[PDB]
Design a binder for this molecule. Structure first.
Ligand SMILES: Cc1[nH]nc2c1[C@](c1cc(-c3ccccc3Cl)cc(C(F)(F)F)c1)(C(C)C)C(C#N)=C(N)O2
Ligand SMILES: Cc1[nH]nc2c1[C@](c1cc(-c3ccccc3Cl)cc(C(F)(F)F)c1)(C(C)C)C(C#N)=C(N)O2
Ligand SMILES: Cc1ncc(COP(=O)(O)O)c(CNCC(=O)O)c1O
Ligand SMILES: Cc1ncc(COP(=O)(O)O)c(CNCC(=O)O)c1O
Ligand SMILES: [Cl-]
Lengths: 442, 442
């Protein structure tokens, strides 16, 4: 007693917007540092009937039966996760149930500290995540600043984590957790130095590696699993999986952490896991442990170096003057245009990027930068030689943005009136679409 | 630079478990009250490339651009939701971003009361959800009992919500929210009477309708939108959508609630929404507003009544001696077998059901009942006449379960040893498989 008519027949209205969405993806230069493109096999998992099943609890300790095939899938996912991140399952555990990155972080933090517990993370404006304890004078913006008592550290004037300031803050604040790993930090992390600071005050070391997960997995960047008590990561950014998350916990350093984390995820915070997610995560993690994927990750970094170099060649400033990873933050202060103006300009030319704060910015109103990254375009087949074209398109968007600011003025409402119909944008959009449109598309 | 080989080719290991799991579903009498089966079009949405997009924020107030097509999908979903539940978009708002039922409840509760806020819900042992404030003498099991201060109301000896106990508790406890709508409650709810209790103490009325959502949308059962401040619901149970959730809020009755709830979902708790989920929710919500789906929901109730009646005809006791909805709780005390035993026996015959407390049980340890429901088998085409066969199969399972307990003893470890290779189970399993396998499968 159901309608099994295909999506196009059942709902033509929805199917047109989704076919439109797909066209826009195929014809966009996607520089969102956090975005990627899933393959068909991952998308077959996400649409699999396995999501019909309720499987509350954990494998071999389920509330319901009928979960033997679900149990194999969840155990396969956990093992492939540990294999992927070069960890022994005798020393490390993984929970694969968190529905997304923010949920994973709130759950892990709760496990370690409980309500009113003390946490330390990087300020949002300096490249930390919202779930790393973010608040504002106006409000406790994240639950992580409200259900916990948080204190926030800044990066220095050159865009670098200031360990001396982290030390100063930890000794006066005495937190139970210190969070590292960030949302828009262009350099590698000194986890060793973080671990030394956590020992000094007796806090746990939490590494959120969502942005750099593939660099850790493939031994291209520093390894937080050598020093951290907990590692969280999303599966959807550079890892190129579905939208989900993983919490890793160090059993050897913390006996009985396994129960704290598993009970935090369920039944403290979640109900039924989404088994289509877990299935999809299994599928991608098998690709992650191939040497073919180490090739892809290596290319991400090669494109990112090449892009940073080409942008600097065109006299565009980068925060920390370069990158050790997949992402770059452009400092737009020498042009006297804000980040949101360039995002608007880049939207008009099918270039996807986001506004981003820089060290000099005190207020999240009018961030002076944009963040860009290469995972998506690297997935679509772009090489080092292709980064000059992207750098050129970005230089051309900055110049147009500067022209429009002079013509229509510095206020944002006025500025946007300048965008539609602009011959140069229409021309530049055209060049973008034609180039992006041609690239392989999963 | 990706592997686009189909799932069978790229991961033959995962694909065999999935193909097995699909067979187990096709060959099971699925009586899980919270389960259903998604059609092909909803599963096309869940595997759609729309999940590649990061779209933090709300439509027309997004942190990024490139979200024109995402915004159309999210607005279509909110509209179709309000229409489905017969509410005016001038008086009611809806948030469609929550990733699951539990997330939605925690978010909504936080919005209304904040950290340390006082909440009241039905005890879990009496049929409430974990996210309705559940705790135990050993621990604060849910976050909703920990981030909030909760008090839990019981149902009476006959399995009914005891309003005089709710009132007495509300007046002494003075909570900011009173939660109604349950996980295993076989009757309709007196929302009007709850509204009268909340008004008396100046608390919000929160209706969790996840189990009965289709009955509310189709006007078959009472309408909580007449009296509630907030209504939450999952989209995956009787509604037959993907795994996601909805939070409804009464703007007329509470000016300024719209902001409290939207901000609580993001950026307080979540990050990026899962747009495949939202697309999927949109697709199903179109089906919900057809008269064809009203027919389906009517049949759910018809099958549930017929099933209740056939079970009573065979001298099986039901909590509250019947049902007003899709679910029944069987009271197994007269046979001296526990709910976990019958769950194991039913697993052995490809009958999916869960163990469930009954009023007499002091503890959640050794529940004396099972919960069953008709949405899944109603989706598979079963009619009133087919309920006698399910009732037959269930009575036969109880009798086998009673025999095995005699033979191997009342201890669960001893009991289970009698299940593999039992001639009658192999026989009964065989009958189940043959009948179940034949039914329409979406
Ligand atoms: C959207 C998001 N999520 N997590 C995030 C961000 C970012 C961000 C957040 C926010 C914001 C501020 C207050 C409340 C809620 C939010 Cl989402 C603002 C901007 C700005 F527009 F100002 F550039 C940007 C970014 C990646 C887009 C961010 C930065 N920089 C970091 N470090 O982390
Ligand atoms: C699994 C689950 N989620 N939400 C739930 C349930 C149930 C349930 C919960 C629990 C439990 C108890 C303590 C801690 C954690 C959990 Cl998950 C136990 C049982 C039992 F097996 F004993 F019958 C059952 C049910 C639907 C399966 C339930 C009941 N009854 C209710 N009212 O609500
Ligand atoms: C370090 C980090 N951790 C957690 C999250 C949360 O993931 P979900 O959105 O799945 O909740 C993000 C989001 N990153 C947003 C961005 O960089 O664009 C992140 O950057
Ligand atoms: C009333 C109610 N509310 C919220 C939830 C949570 O939904 P998620 O699992 O999507 O978090 C449930 C789950 N119900 C479990 C069952 O009845 O089988 C529920 O019964
Ligand atoms: Cl999903």
């Amino acid at each position: 007693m159901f309608n099994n008519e295909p999506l196009e027949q059942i709902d033509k209205e929805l199917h047109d917007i989704l076919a439109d969405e797909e066209k826009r993806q195929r014809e966009t230069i996607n520089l969102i540092a956090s975005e990627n493109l899933t393959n068909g096999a991952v998308r077959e998992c996400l649409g699999n009937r396995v999501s019909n099943k309720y499987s509350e609890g954990y494998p071999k300790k389920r509330y319901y039966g009928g979960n033997d095939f679900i149990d194999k899938i969840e155990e396969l996912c956990q093992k492939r996760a540990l294999e992927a991140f070069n960890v022994s399952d005798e020393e490390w555990g993984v929970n694969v149930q968190p529905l997304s990155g923010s949920a994973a972080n709130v759950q892990a933090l709760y496990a370690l500290v409980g309500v009113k517990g003390k946490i330390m993370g990087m300020h949002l404006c300096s490249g930390g995540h919202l779930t790393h304890g973010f608040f504002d004078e106006k409000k406790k913006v994240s639950i992580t600043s409200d259900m916990f008592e948080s204190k926030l550290y800044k990066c220095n004037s050159q865009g670098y984590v200031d360990l001396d300031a982290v030390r100063e803050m930890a000794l006066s604040f005495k937190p139970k957790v210190i969070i590292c790993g960030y949302t828009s930090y262009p350099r590698d992390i000194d986890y060793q130095q973080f671990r030394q600071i956590c020992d000094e005050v007796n806090a746990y070391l939490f590494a959120d590696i969502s942005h750099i997960s593939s660099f850790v997995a493939c031994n291209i960047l520093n390894n937080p699993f050598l020093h951290a008590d907990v590692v969280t990561t999303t599966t959807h950014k550079i890892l190129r999986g579905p939208r989900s998350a993983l919490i890793f916990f160090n059993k050897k350093r913390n006996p009985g952490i396994e129960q704290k984390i598993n009970s935090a995820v369920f039944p403290s915070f979640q109900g039924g896991p989404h088994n289509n997610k877990i299935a999809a995560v299994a599928c991608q993690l098998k690709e992650v442990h191939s040497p073919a994927f180490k090739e892809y990750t290596q290319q991400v970094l090669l494109n990112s170096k090449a892009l940073a170099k080409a942008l600097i060649s065109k006299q565009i400033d980068l925060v920390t003057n370069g990158t050790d990873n997949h992402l770059i933050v452009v400092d737009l202060r020498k042009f006297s245009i804000t980040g949101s103006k360039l995002q608007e300009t880049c939207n008009a030319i099918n270039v996807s990027l986001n506004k981003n704060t820089i060290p000099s910015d005190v207020d999240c109103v009018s961030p002076s930068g944009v963040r860009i990254g290469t995972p998506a375009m690297t997935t679509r087949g772009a090489k080092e030689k292709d980064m000059e074209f992207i750098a050129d398109v970005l230089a051309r968007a900055i110049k147009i943005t500067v022209d429009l600011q002079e013509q229509y003025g510095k206020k944002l409402v006025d500025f946007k009136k300048g965008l539609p119909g602009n011959a140069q944008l229409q021309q530049l959009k055209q060049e973008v679409v034609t180039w992006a449109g041609a690239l392989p598309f999963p």
